[PDB]
């Protein structure tokens, strides 16, 4: 997930199982004030939902990940 962060402009999130791609897009925009280009979602083999949230070219994923706190 992290190599995706500094290579694909992608933030990888565990999100609610009740969240759809619209809600994930809206939440990321509100919690992190970044603009979202695309969201891909999958249900992991442990029952949680993983969201691949790619940002627009105008935002970096490293700086946002740093601002959130990890890496």
């Amino acid at each position: 997930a992290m190599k995706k962060v500094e290579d694909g402009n992608i933030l990888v999130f565990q999100v609610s199982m009740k969240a759809n791609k619209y809600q994930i897009k809206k939440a990321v925009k509100e919690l992190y004030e970044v603009d979202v280009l695309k969201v891909n979602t999958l249900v992991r083999p442990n029952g949680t939902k993983k969201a691949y949230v790619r940002l627009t070219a105008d935002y970096d994923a490293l700086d946002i990940a740093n601002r959130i706190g990890y890496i």
Binding site: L31, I68, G69, Y70
Partner: protein, 119 residues
């Protein structure tokens, strides 16, 4: 330590909403820190603080609704008493005590008397 509900009750709705958002942010930041720190005990304190704020908010909204429906028929069913299905089915004390005028006349005329076998 967490929040105290008796402190929270002296706050307005906007203040409780603001504290609730602040605590949710705190939990989100702490769940990020849990990724690197092997153990995090502060999570539980903030989680219970969120429950305490939501509890107080709910108590204030429910109380204000009770005031809205004060002393009028047809309360909301959630604000009615939750005794038991059969107990809520039972005749009221008024209905149970109802008698015919004929029975009431007999009860007045010939009540059970107090007496003793002594003399």
């Amino acid at each position: 330590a967490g929040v105290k509900a008796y402190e929270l009750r002296t706050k307005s709705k906007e203040q409780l909403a603001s504290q609730l958002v602040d605590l949710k942010k705190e939990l989100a930041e702490l769940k990020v820190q849990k990724l690197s720190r092997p153990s995090l005990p502060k999570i539980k304190t903030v989680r219970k603080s969120i429950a305490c704020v939501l509890t107080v908010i709910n108590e204030q909204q429910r109380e204000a609704v009770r005031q809205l429906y004060k002393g009028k028929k047809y309360q909301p069913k959630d604000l009615r008493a939750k005794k038991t299905r059969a107990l809520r089915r039972a005749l009221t004390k008024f209905e149970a005590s109802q008698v015919t005028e004929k029975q009431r006349k007999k009860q007045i005329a010939f009540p059970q008397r107090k007496y003793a076998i002594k003399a």
